[PDB]
Amino acid sequence: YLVPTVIEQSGERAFDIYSRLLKERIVFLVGPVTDESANLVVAQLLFLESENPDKDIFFYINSPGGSVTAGMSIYDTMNFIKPDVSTLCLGQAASMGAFLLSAGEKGKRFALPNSRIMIHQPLISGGLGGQASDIEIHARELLKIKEKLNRLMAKHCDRDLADLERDTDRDNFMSAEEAKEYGLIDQILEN
Amino acid sequence: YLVPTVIEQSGERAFDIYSRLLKERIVFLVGPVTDESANLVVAQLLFLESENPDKDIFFYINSPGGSVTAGMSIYDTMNFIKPDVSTLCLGQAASMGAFLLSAGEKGKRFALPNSRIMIHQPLISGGLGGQASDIEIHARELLKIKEKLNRLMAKHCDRDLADLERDTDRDNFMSAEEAKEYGLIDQILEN
Amino acid sequence: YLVPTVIEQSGRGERAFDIYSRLLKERIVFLVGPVTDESANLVVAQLLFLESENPDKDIFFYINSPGGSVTAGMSIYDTMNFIKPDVSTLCLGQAASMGAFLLSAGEKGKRFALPNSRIMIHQPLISGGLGGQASDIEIHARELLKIKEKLNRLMAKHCDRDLADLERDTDRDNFMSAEEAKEYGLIDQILEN
Amino acid sequence: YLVPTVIEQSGERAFDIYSRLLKERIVFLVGPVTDESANLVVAQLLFLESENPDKDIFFYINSPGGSVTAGMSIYDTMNFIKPDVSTLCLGQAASMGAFLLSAGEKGKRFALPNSRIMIHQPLISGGLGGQASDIEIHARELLKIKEKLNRLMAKHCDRDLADLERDTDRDNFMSAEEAKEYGLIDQILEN
Amino acid sequence: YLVPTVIEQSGGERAFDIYSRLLKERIVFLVGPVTDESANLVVAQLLFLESENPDKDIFFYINSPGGSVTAGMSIYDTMNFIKPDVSTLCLGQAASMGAFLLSAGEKGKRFALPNSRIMIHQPLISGGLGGQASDIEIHARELLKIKEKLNRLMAKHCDRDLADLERDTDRDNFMSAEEAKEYGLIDQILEN
Amino acid sequence: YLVPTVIEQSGERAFDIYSRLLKERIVFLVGPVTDESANLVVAQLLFLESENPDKDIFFYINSPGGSVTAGMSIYDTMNFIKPDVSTLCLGQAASMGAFLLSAGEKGKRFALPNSRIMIHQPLISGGLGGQASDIEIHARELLKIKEKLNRLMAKHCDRDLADLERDTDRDNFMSAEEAKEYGLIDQILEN
Amino acid sequence: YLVPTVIEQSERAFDIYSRLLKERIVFLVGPVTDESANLVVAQLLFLESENPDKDIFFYINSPGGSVTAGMSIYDTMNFIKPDVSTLCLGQAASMGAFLLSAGEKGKRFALPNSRIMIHQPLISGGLGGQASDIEIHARELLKIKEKLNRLMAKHCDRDLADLERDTDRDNFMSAEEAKEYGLIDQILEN
Amino acid sequence: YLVPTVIRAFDIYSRLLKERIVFLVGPVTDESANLVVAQLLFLESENPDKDIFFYINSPGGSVTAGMSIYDTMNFIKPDVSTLCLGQAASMGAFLLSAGEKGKRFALPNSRIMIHQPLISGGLGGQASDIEIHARELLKIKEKLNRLMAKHCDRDLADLERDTDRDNFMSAEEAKEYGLIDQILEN
Amino acid sequence: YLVPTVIEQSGERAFDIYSRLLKERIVFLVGPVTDESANLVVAQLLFLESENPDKDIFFYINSPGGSVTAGMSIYDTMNFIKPDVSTLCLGQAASMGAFLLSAGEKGKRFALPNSRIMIHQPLISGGLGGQASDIEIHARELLKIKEKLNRLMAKHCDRDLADLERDTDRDNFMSAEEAKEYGLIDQILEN
Amino acid sequence: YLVPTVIEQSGERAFDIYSRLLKERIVFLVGPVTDESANLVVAQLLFLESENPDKDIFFYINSPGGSVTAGMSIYDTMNFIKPDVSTLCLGQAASMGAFLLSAGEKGKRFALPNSRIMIHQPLISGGLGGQASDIEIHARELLKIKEKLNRLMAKHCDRDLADLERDTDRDNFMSAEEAKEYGLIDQILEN
């Protein structure tokens, strides 16, 4: 894709439109969460903290999910850095995208009216081949991740761990209103 | 493709021709609607609101359709931002392209005389594999999307939900005149 | 594979069979591997043939199958229930999915499993793809749910259990030993010697 | 697959089990309807008429559908030959399989209790490439086939053509009881 | 596919595959595409049947989408050469060379079943047209000669003008059994 | 390909050679007509109108054809914008390329002496799969497009619709002289 | 394909091609390959043994094939004592036309709508390797080209110069044109 | 392969079946396992008292397929003697050890390998599905070690150590371990 | 490939080496003639005419051939523009490359001593599939192109059309001396 | 690969390292000889002649061979331009690479001590398919090229044509010392 160039008035500085929005403390997570796309989010979050530790960071999420470890690098960076990270769901926040949406600062988690939010237990975090001993190890690691994600989700949503265990058993699709009632987001934007 | 470079008189500034048209508040949606192409539209819509919240934005659509969630990120951005988003159909506006065309500000939805506008119920928003329980969930989510799109279309067109349910059952191709009579567009441009 | 040839002794002469035709002569029908239109129709052809050879004698239906098509399995199932002779079922190796269904479909009191066999029951997967328009996907989703309910209902009947029990237990792949299948109600006895 | 061999008592004659059942006037249509599988059915129907024109022929159907022209070769052979062709649905009779099921002699069309019968308008009878003139021709031929199949179905079922046009619009799945009520079969066998 | 075996009663018993049994009754099937191999089997059967009985009719059952022109012409010339009349019957479909061979049956003995589909059209590629413009010219000329030959023989079969077949074979011309009868491709439509 | 850089004397400005020719109001349509290549032509046509609404735009066409909807986006832009769009055929103008050639301002449609111009009815505007009902819809849409293109061609050429229907039935190749006599172009350039 | 079985009264059950071989009919159908050519040779040798005096009927429906494979048939036809009559069904192209013309003079036939095509050979094998290897293979192909034109000219009672012109590019002939050319002697009708 | 005919005319494997010799050659599949079962059933009837000779040259295969053989061997009345030719690995070693105690043989240069099972089927889907398949694989692992330990007259703890990774044994080591009873020479 | 950068003394201007040679009025046609490579030649020829209509343009050809329509866009541009286009054969000028070589201004067509020039009738200008009617049309168009190319070649070479028809029947390879004697080039350069 | 950037002291000018070495009149031929890689060498040779017709050009060769026509474009350019072209073998000079090495100015052809020089008759200059008449033509053209290359090699090496015909029959590998004794190079560099 061709990324448009925009001019900032200050003299003038030419930006690509995403660098221009980063200047406004807007970080996008678009598409699958990968090591590379997650590390760019982390780099942007770290950079924005240095620019101004007190101002909010706006983390716009339009993602079907992705790697758990990659999503956790974002998650821990969001919680670590001093400035509040506000999260906004555009289009969809599914799987780790929903996790990172719910991970925003409480009171500053938003969704657009027709966005779709989906929460579910993790799938393969990696293949389970090799010997039964190797398969046992990877099955145990996946269960620990499953419990960790449900526990952190339950914390984000102010719900019991038992509720998240039921609700993430199979793909649980929610409207913005249902996500608000559930506790994944705080507000729904209109204008 | 090689994107031409044009010179803006002000000193001089060299733009690619799409960045030059963005300076005139023209945003293009060309080809399939994807997370990446939809997020560029959103980034441009957000940027243009900041530049001037009062001036109209011109959203030129030549698209066969694409992802619903990606199209909804555009749709909610169009409705959220203060400036009116005028929509123009070039070549075709099909599926989510027709939805976004109809989503323009009422009275400012345009089509060119020989453009083709097609509305239809959604197809797979994602595969339906796994167990019958998973297939049930995805079938239910697709039906909710189907109803949401028909409901929003009916609102755009000032028609009954029952009319959109009939008319989107199978691919419904319309000339610019038929789209105007239907309520998808307001005017047809000639000169 | 090369299927061995065996000689059946009759009066002053010998008939040469492949070993599976020889076992069919003893009223043994094998369902081995996936259930397909072709493998299911051979079972049906054998069941029909055996009923006529002797409507009163039991038929022995040996099952070693991971599952397969529901409609193909239902052609066997309805043939088993229709024909006059009792169809005894035996699980060798495994009876999974429609293989477990056909195992449980044997004549009550004559459903067997070998001691180390594995029996697995679960809700059906795709009976066919769900593409096309949302209207087509709705239709296929509804048909799959009707099949799901039909299979759980027939399973519950076979096992003398409540439909609610089969709905829980077939939600995800439910693996059972021969003893667990006997306690569940899928089989009646476990053979040893 | 290995087709078992069975011995007929008469001296003795060794048959494959399908030739043995043909001796009992049982003809199987299993799997897709193709030129080759349809011509075997025709060859068997012809052969059985010569053996005994007065005795019924039993046509066992377990088929997802197939070619219309191939199915029509069976259909016309069934109607032409003197002996009644009784039809039985095993597992499924879908598309042309349902057509041939309904084409059995009225009063002798059977289904097993858990069989599945599906009727629908035809899909591509052949690709529609080439020039718009060629596409027009193939579209017209497909519509003529569509009307012919609905008309013959309506005749088989003692229903109005308008009913079959509604009901074959999209895949219409029926239980044996629903097929009996519809008019596709006459009886449901149990024992 | 498994081809069933049937038993013929005679003076003893003989076991046939069902197609060899029908050949014994002078029924020759052309099913599926016309290829060198499928066409040569038809020719071998036509030659064999002439020798068995030169006076009795041969019944040539056609269910074919078309195929090679040269392969179809080997059948066509064999049909016309051998003494016994070759009656033709359309089952399912007779398209392209299948329709040609259907129309090539003995006049008065060309049949179709009521719901059969008969399609006539000009030939497509009889072979690729690559190489040099000189080679392409040659193959284009050969294809046009074949086109004219097929329309001329069709017009003869149908008792129509060559000009009519040239119009009607320009694009795929689908006909019901009734339309094929009116056109002149078949003589009768069977019902019972 | 490496696109040469040329220097414009004014100070100096370095252009790629196509941006340099755009500065002279020359727009190229080279190769297949796609959404992307058509939208660049539209962007250039819109840009040139803004630069000078009165001066002619020179639209150089060397194209085998392409998408109808993409070509129609160019076509409607050509007719909409105030400045005359002169069209020149280089090498070939086939299918939608011939349509856009004939769409130039009457009296300003040119071809080079050895160019090749080919007009024909459209092929598939999209596949015709699915159910016979879907195939009927797409066949009807293709016929409407066929009629629309012949009608607009007949208007461009000052011919009867009946003439274009004959002449576009199969690929109709024309020399520049034959295209001039037909009415697709007005003049043939030599020097 | 399923090859029908027929019963010969004498009973003996044959596949229909073995039944026609009993009548001294040998088929060459499809491409000429080492395997299909060797079956023709085996049948020609067998038939000479059964009766050295009776004609053999060699039915040809072939687009062409290998030259060496076709030459094994050709030399067998010329060697064995009984005349080999040749008939063109459908088509006789390339080596198929060569073998058609190779039939006994006066006994080369074609059916009325058959197509006969003669042309210079294409690659008898690839020409890779070094320029020295390419030179060798080019020379061998030219020798084959000359040999085929020379034998064709002999079959047709024409000058070598005529075959060199006429085989330059694919030369398609009707049965009548092949008869006038000299590839066949008669055209059968009934 | 062309299977020789020996003199009624038998193929050489049907001829050896007449001598109560059943071959398991190559991978254990549903189809190859069911032929062994069909042959074992057939031989029991031809003579319930005479030994059956089960010649094994197999790298392993499906557990469920191997268990159909295993249960048939234990069920039928006649003793099933087992002989290792070339190799008996994985389920092939299991079926070798499953022969009648005192009648399990190996040829001198044969190779016998025992190991825990690998995937009995893929582990995709949701973590809940992966948990189920991991549990089923562990139950199979324990069942195989338990039956192996019974065959070998060893503790379950010994088989759990020794099957952790591919454990290759000579015929002598397999005899000392308890997988076979004797080694044939002449 | 990495295209070297060279510095022009004037201040200094950095060019890629091909843009530097374009500044000297040298246009390269290297490799196959395609719509894209032909349009760059046309763009360069048009540009150079504007820079100086009187000075010669040097068109260096090292090409195996390519599309006829693409080559004709170059050919007509060469003949149209006022400045003489001198042509030089480097390595090879085959098929349309030989045509464009011979198309240079008479007296200014050059070849290097060990260059190879090959002339031949065209091959497929496009596939010949579809119906015999479509194949007839494409065969006729190819023959018209064949005659046009031989006629223009004969004009370039001052030979009879009959000579070019013989000589282009099969690939006709010529040394620079043979091409000079034939009439394809005027001179052979040495130093 | 990332091509390093180096700074030239003059103010400062940043070059990629190959453009920097071109400034020193060093032209590299690395890897296979293709139309594109050969034309860059030609462009560089032409450029360097213009910069200084009298100074030597250093042509560094590390090439396994390639196209003959492409190599001949270099060869004729080397011989045409006024400045001597010195050639140096690095790593290897095989096939046309050895030809171009031997083509350097007599007395200025160099090789590094452990370089490998291989001479051989050409392979396929293009495939030999089609008809025996086409194969004859291509075989004749290949033989003419073979003779031309041996003749030019013999001239370069001051040997008889008969010697090169023997020695190029099969791949003839030479050390730098053997190439010097043969006559392919004049000197071997050490320090």
Neighbours of D10 (CB within 10 A): 8
Structure-derived torsion over alpha carbons of residues D53, D55, D61, D65, reported in degrees to the nearest 10: 20
Q: Is C192 on the interface with H (CB under 8 A)?
A: yes
DSSP for C23-57 reads HHTTTEEEEESSB-HHHHHHHHHHHHHHHHH-SSS
Instruction: Out of D63, D86, D95, D102, pick the active-site residue.
Output: D95
Q: Is I130 on the interface with J (CB under 8 A)?
A: no
Q: ∠ at Cα B115 (B109, B116), nearest 5°?
A: 100
> Nearest to residue G98, comparing CAs of G142, G62, G48, G130?
G62
Q: Are strands C174-177 and C118-121 parallel, antiparallel or unpaired?
A: antiparallel
Distance (Å, rounded) from C-alpha J138 to C-alpha J144?
A: 10
Chain D and chain F share a number of CB contacts under 8 A equal to: 58
Q: Is H31 on the interface with C (CB under 8 A)?
A: yes
Q: Which other chains touch chain D, taking contact as 3+ CB pairs less than 8 Å apart?
A: C, E, F
Q: Is E117 on the interface with D (CB under 8 A)?
A: yes
Whether residue C138 and residue B139 make contact (CB cut-off 8 A), yes or no, is yes
Q: Which residue of D has its CA nearest to E191?
A: D80
Cβ-contact E98, E91 below 8 angstroms? no
Gaps after residue numbers in chain G (C–N over 2.5 angstroms): 10
Q: Is the dihedral of CA D176, D179, D181, D184 positive or negative?
A: negative
For residue F50, the Cα-to-chain-centroid distance in whole angstroms is 21
Distance (Å, rounded) from C-alpha F23 to C-alpha H58?
A: 77
Q: Which other chains touch chain J, taking contact as 3+ CB pairs less than 8 Å apart?
A: G, I
> Nearest to residue C40, comparing CAs of C86, C99, C113, C128?
C99
Whether residue I115 and residue J76 make contact (CB cut-off 8 A), yes or no, is yes
List the structure tokens of B179.
């789209």
Q: Is the dihedral of CA G53, G54, G55, G57 positive or negative?
A: negative
Angle subtended by helix axes G67-79 and G34-50, to nearest 10: 10
Domain ranges of chain D: 1-191
Secondary structure of residue I6 in the 3-state scheme: strand
Cβ-contact G3, G16 below 8 angstroms? yes
> Nearest to residue B47, comparing CAs of A20, A70, G133?
A20
Distance (Å, rounded) from C-alpha A126 to C-alpha A142?
A: 9
Cβ-contact G43, G26 below 8 angstroms? yes
Neighbours of E192 (CB within 10 A): 6
Q: Which residue of E has its CA nearest to G29?
A: E36
Cβ-contact H92, H56 below 8 angstroms? yes
CA distances from D62 to A42, C84, E153, F65, F108 (A): 59, 22, 43, 48, 68
Q: ∠ at Cα J166 (J160, J167), nearest 5°?
A: 90
Residue of D4, D14, D91 with shortest CB distance to C72: D91
Q: Is C20 on the interface with H (CB under 8 A)?
A: yes
List the structure tokens of J146.
């073979």
B35: left (phi over 0), alpha (psi -120 to 50) or beta: alpha
Cβ-contact E78, E40 below 8 angstroms? no
Residues sharing a CB contact under 8 Å with residue G160, sequence separation 6 or more, in sequence order? G149, G150, G153
Residues of E with Cβ-Cβ distance to D13 under 8 angstroms: 7, 13, 15
Q: Are strands A26-30 and A12-16 parallel, antiparallel or unpaired?
A: unpaired
For residue F71, the Cα-to-chain-centroid distance in whole angstroms is 7
Q: Which element (helix H / strand E) includes B18? A: helix B17-22
> Nearest to residue A176, comparing CAs of A11, A45, A79, A61?
A61
CA distances from I151 to D183, I159, I164 (A): 74, 9, 8
Q: Are strands H104-106 and A12-16 parallel, antiparallel or unpaired?
A: unpaired
Whether residue D16 and residue E6 make contact (CB cut-off 8 A), yes or no, is no
The experimental technique used to determine this model is: cryo-EM
CA distances from E165 to C128, E147, E156, E185, I151 (A): 45, 11, 10, 11, 39
Q: Is C173 on the interface with H (CB under 8 A)?
A: yes
Distance (Å, rounded) from C-alpha D51 to C-alpha D47?
A: 6
Please give, one letter per residue, the 3-state secondary structure of J14-59: EEEHHHHHHCCCEEEEECCECHHHHHHHHHHHHHHHHHCCCCCEEE
Residue E67 DSSP label: B
> Nearest to residue B62, comparing CAs of H175, J123, F73?
F73
Whether residue I122 and residue E140 make contact (CB cut-off 8 A), yes or no, is no
Q: How far is C7 from chain D (nearest CA, A)?
A: 14
Residues of J with Cβ-Cβ distance to G130 under 8 angstroms: 120-123, 169-170
Q: Is F137 on the interface with D (CB under 8 A)?
A: no
Kindly list the catalytic residues of G.
94, 119
List the structure tokens of J109.
């052809």
Whether residue E36 and residue G20 make contact (CB cut-off 8 A), yes or no, is no
> Nearest to residue B68, comparing CAs of C48, J124, G106, C134?
C134
Q: Is D146 on the interface with F (CB under 8 A)?
A: yes
Could you tell me the fold of the domain covering F1-191? 2-enoyl-CoA Hydratase; Chain A, domain 1 (3.90.226)
- Is E121 considered catalytic here? yes
Q: Which residue has 């080759």 as its token pair?
A: D36
List the structure tokens of E65.
């989408």
Q: Is I173 on the interface with F (CB under 8 A)?
A: no
List the structure tokens of A94.
């599914």
Q: Which other chains touch chain A, taking contact as 3+ CB pairs less than 8 Å apart?
A: B, H
List the structure tokens of I81.
């523009």
Q: Is the dihedral of CA C118, C123, C127, C131 positive or negative?
A: negative
At least 3 CB pairs under 8 A between chains J and G: yes
Distance (Å, rounded) from C-alpha J83 to C-alpha F8?
A: 33
Residues of D with Cβ-Cβ distance to C4 under 8 angstroms: none
Q: Which CATH superfamily is domain G1-190 in?
A: 2-enoyl-CoA Hydratase; Chain A, domain 1 (3.90.226.10)
Angle subtended by helix axes J68-80 and J35-51, to nearest 10: 10
Distance (Å, rounded) from C-alpha C94 to C-alpha G160?
A: 76
Strand partners, H114: H167
Q: How far is I7 from chain J (nearest CA, A)?
A: 9
DSSP for J127-186 reads ---S-HHHHHHHHHHHHHHHHHHHHHHHHHHT--HHHHHHHTSS-EEEEHHHHHHHTS-S
List the structure tokens of G42.
């085996």
Q: Which element (helix H / strand E) includes E129? A: none
Q: Which element (helix H / strand E) includes C79? A: helix C70-82
Q: Which residue of B has its CA nearest to F80?
A: B191
Helix, strand, coil percentages in chain E from 3-state DSSP, rounded to 5? 45, 25, 30
**What is the amino acid identity at position H84?**
C
List the structure tokens of I46.
């048009």
CATH architecture of the domain covering E1-192 = Alpha-Beta Complex (3.90)
Structure-derived torsion over alpha carbons of residues E71, E75, E77, E80, reported in degrees to the nearest 10: -160
Q: Is A147 on the interface with H (CB under 8 A)?
A: no
Distance (Å, rounded) from C-alpha F168 to C-alpha F177?
A: 18
Distance (Å, rounded) from C-alpha F67 to C-alpha F73?
A: 10
- In Å, the largest CA–CA distance within chain C is 69
Residues of J with Cβ-Cβ distance to G136 under 8 angstroms: none
For the domain made up of H1-186, the CATH class stated in words is alpha beta
Q: How far is I101 from chain F (nearest CA, A)?
A: 17
Instruction: Out of F37, F67, F73, F95, pick the active-site residue.
Output: F95
- The 10 Å CB-count burial string (b at 16+, else e) for B145-180 is bbebbbebbbebbebeeeebbebbbbbbbbbbeebb
Whether residue C15 and residue D7 make contact (CB cut-off 8 A), yes or no, is yes
Structure-derived torsion over alpha carbons of residues B61, B67, B68, B72, reported in degrees to the nearest 10: -60
List the structure tokens of G76.
């067998």
Structure-derived torsion over alpha carbons of residues E154, E156, E158, E162, reported in degrees to the nearest 10: 70
Cβ-contact G138, J139 below 8 angstroms? yes
Instruction: Out of I73, I86, I95, I115, pick the active-site residue.
Output: I95
Residues sharing a CB contact under 8 Å with residue D77, sequence separation 6 or more, in sequence order? D41, D42, D45, D46, E91, E113
Q: Which residue of F has its CA nearest to D166?
A: F133
Residue of J19, J42, J140 with shortest CB distance to I5: J19
Distance (Å, rounded) from C-alpha G90 to C-alpha I129?
A: 23
CA distances from J23 to D75, I8, J16, J42, J45 (A): 85, 12, 11, 15, 12
Cβ-contact I38, F62 below 8 angstroms? yes
Distance (Å, rounded) from C-alpha C117 to C-alpha C92?
A: 6
Whether residue C74 and residue D28 make contact (CB cut-off 8 A), yes or no, is no
Q: How far is D148 from chain E (nearest CA, A)?
A: 9
Q: How far is B124 from chain C (nearest CA, A)?
A: 6
List the structure tokens of E118.
């008969």
Q: Which residue of E has its CA nearest to G3?
A: E41
Residues sharing a CB contact under 8 Å with residue E157, sequence separation 6 or more, in sequence order? E103, E104, E107, E184, E185
Whether residue B135 and residue C123 make contact (CB cut-off 8 A), yes or no, is no
- What's the CATH number of domain C1-193, 3.30.110.30, 3.30.830.10, 3.40.470.10, 3.90.226.10? 3.90.226.10
- In Å, the largest CA–CA distance within chain I is 66
**What is the amino acid identity at position F185?**
I
Resolution (A): 3.3
Most E CBs within 10 Å: which of D7, D10, D42, D143, as the mutation test of the E interface? D42
Q: Is I137 on the interface with E (CB under 8 A)?
A: no
Q: Which other chains touch chain G, taking contact as 3+ CB pairs less than 8 Å apart?
A: E, J
Q: Are strands B109-111 and B26-30 parallel, antiparallel or unpaired?
A: unpaired
Distance (Å, rounded) from C-alpha E142 to C-alpha D74?
A: 39
Residues of E with Cβ-Cβ distance to G91 under 8 angstroms: 70
> Nearest to residue E138, comparing CAs of E147, E148, E129, E151?
E129
Most B CBs within 10 Å: which of A21, A24, A62, as the mutation test of the B interface? A62
At A47, give phi and psi (nearest 5°): -60, -45
Cβ-contact G16, G6 below 8 angstroms? yes
Residue of E39, E45, E77 with shortest CB distance to G16: E45
Cβ-contact E74, G89 below 8 angstroms? yes
Residues of A with Cβ-Cβ distance to H161 under 8 angstroms: none
